[PDB]
Amino acid sequence: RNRRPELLPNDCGYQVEADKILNGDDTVPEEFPWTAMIGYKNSSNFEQFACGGSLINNRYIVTAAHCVAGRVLRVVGALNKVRLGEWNTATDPDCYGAVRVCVPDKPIDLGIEETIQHPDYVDGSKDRYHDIALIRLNRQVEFTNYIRPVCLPQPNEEVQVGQRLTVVGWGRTETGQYSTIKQKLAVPVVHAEQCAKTFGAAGVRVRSSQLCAGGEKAKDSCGGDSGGPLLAERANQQFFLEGLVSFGATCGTEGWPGIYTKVGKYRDWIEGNIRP
Numbered sequence: 001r002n003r004r005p006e007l008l009p010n011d012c013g014y015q016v017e018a019d020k021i022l023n024g025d026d027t028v029p030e031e032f033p034w035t036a037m038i039g040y041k042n043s044s045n046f047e048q049f050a051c052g053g054s055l056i057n058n059r060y061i062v063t064a065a066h067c068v069a070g071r072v073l074r075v076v077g078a079l080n081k082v083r084l085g086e087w088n089t090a091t092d093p094d095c096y097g098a099v100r101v102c103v104p105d106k107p108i109d110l111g112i113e114e115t116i117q118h119p120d121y122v123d124g125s126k127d128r129y130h131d132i133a134l135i136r137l138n139r140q141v142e143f144t145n146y147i148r149p150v151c152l153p154q155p156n157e158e159v160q161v162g163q164r165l166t167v168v169g170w171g172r173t174e175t176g177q178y179s180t181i182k183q184k185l186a187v188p189v190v191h192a193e194q195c196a197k198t199f200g201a202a203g204v205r206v207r208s209s210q211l212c213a214g215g216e217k218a219k220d221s222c223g224g225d226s227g228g229p230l231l232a233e234r235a236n237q238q239f240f241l242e243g244l245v246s247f248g249a250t251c252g253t254e255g256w257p258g259i260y261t262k263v264g265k266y267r268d269w270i271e272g273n274i275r276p
């Protein structure tokens, strides 16, 4: 299967601590430097960012398969670019804090060399089982304080119910707000049964490769992007990509937690589909 585990760097999951003035759910630009924005372009050349993803090394982002096939492609446009190093999409340069500083680096928009959807994913399916895809970027990415790779779990590692994780993004889901500043929201992992309604179709079972997180005690935590990261902070403040958004959480009266692709469960597949 041509697995190349050594192409996933050991220097992963570390971010600069450079924190500052009054927050909210807003991040500083240095937080979660593996976030990516996925950009689309329709037939009259209108562009917009409508999905997220996570930088895993200097050549790849990992996202949901539903971000690279089907509905998004007809509703928004063709897959076009991936943006790294963004913080506030409303501004450029990005400047923050009472004692003011600016991000030295303009966000980078990279082309897509190839997209690899998981072979077992079915576009339009009720369950979206195996909702994962790799995007090989056009260029080797040089890491900075604002662009760095996230760690991936091993296939035998499990998140436990009650464990708190962080979903990060710009509200780029079907029902999201489309925020301009990158947001972080803390969410509990919950029993799979609580995601019964998440599919928006009855009778779908939550598989082992799916994670249910959000819910009744996390009504202030809706955000993230389709394909966007769900993170565990493990020992030594090293962040791991426990999940990516497959069905977004909804935080209203009759809403539901989100279903995430368990990324560790696809570690072998990832390693077999990356090249230097």
Ligand SMILES: *[C@@H]1O[C@H](CO)[C@@H](O)[C@H](O)[C@H]1NC(C)=O
Pocket (backbone or CB within 6 Å): 042, 043, 044, 045, 046
């Ligand atoms: C491209 O998107 C813009 C903005 O949403 C829209 O006005 C336009 O109709 C789209 N192009 C077509 C005709 O597909």
Ligand SMILES: [Ca+2]
Pocket (backbone or CB within 6 Å): 086, 087, 088, 089, 090, 091, 092, 093, 094, 107
């Ligand atoms: Ca910006």
